[PDB]
Amino acid sequence: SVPSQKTYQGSYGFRLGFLHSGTAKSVTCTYSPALNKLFCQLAKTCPVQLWVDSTPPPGTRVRAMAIYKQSQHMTEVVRRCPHHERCSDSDGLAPPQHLIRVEGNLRAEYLDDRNTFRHSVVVPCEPPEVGSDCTTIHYNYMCYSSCMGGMNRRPILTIITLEDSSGNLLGRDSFEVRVCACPGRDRRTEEENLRKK
Ligand SMILES: [Zn+2]
């Protein structure tokens, strides 16, 4: 009833990476290593790098799923709020209830789990292009952390799983997410609060 969040590199040395975007007022997505937390604006591009030490087999996939970070909310499905699920902002592929979308990948598949009712989005694991050492997935988060009747100010984690063609686990990583109007300021504030504590 709760997806695992345990970091697991597995046989292929799977782990995430994030750009260094800074904390200027104009930044739309920024990652805090000290907090392991991504701060982003609503429906803006969030580049997430995938790093491996060796190439996984053909048919390997990469799945993203959100869960509530607090244990007392972890069994509740993370979904878009009653406003955003009805705002007709469909990209033609993501169900309107799904918080997490993949941008610019026609091979993305969206799952409503028949047993847990949780949402996820999964893409093929592509090898790095010539001249690159990693691959990047562009995610979008489609509600604010503050949306009433949805996340309702509760923090979430995104869990990224590397899976074989049957869906079996090959690797796992995760990060907290705050979707907010001013990610640069909020990252600075939370990093200062951590330093003071
Ligand atoms: Zn919303």
Q: 42 CA distance to ligand 1 centroid (A)?
A: 9
Contacts of residue 171, defined as CB under 8 A and 6 or more positions apart, other chains included, come to 8, 9, 10, 12, 14, 15, 161, 162
**Percent helix, percent strand, percent coil in the chain, to nearest 5:** 10, 35, 55
Catalogue all structural domains in the chain, each as residue range(s) with its CATH number. 1-197 (2.60.40.720)
Q: What is the Cα Rg of the chain in Å?
A: 16
Q: 191 CA distance to ligand 1 centroid (A)?
A: 25
How far is Cα 111 from Cα 43, in angstroms, rounded to an integer? 20
Q: 145 CA distance to ligand 1 centroid (A)?
A: 8
Phi/psi for 84 (5° steps) reads -70, -30
SS3 at position 86? helix
Q: 17 CA distance to ligand 1 centroid (A)?
A: 27
Q: Is 81 marked within a binding site?
A: yes
This structure's resolution (Å) is: 1.2
CA nearest neighbour of 99 among 72, 74, 118: 118
Q: 76 CA distance to ligand 1 centroid (A)?
A: 16
How far is Cα 159 from Cα 67, in angstroms, rounded to an integer? 8
Q: Is 147 marked within a binding site?
A: yes
How far is Cα 108 from Cα 63, in angstroms, rounded to an integer? 10
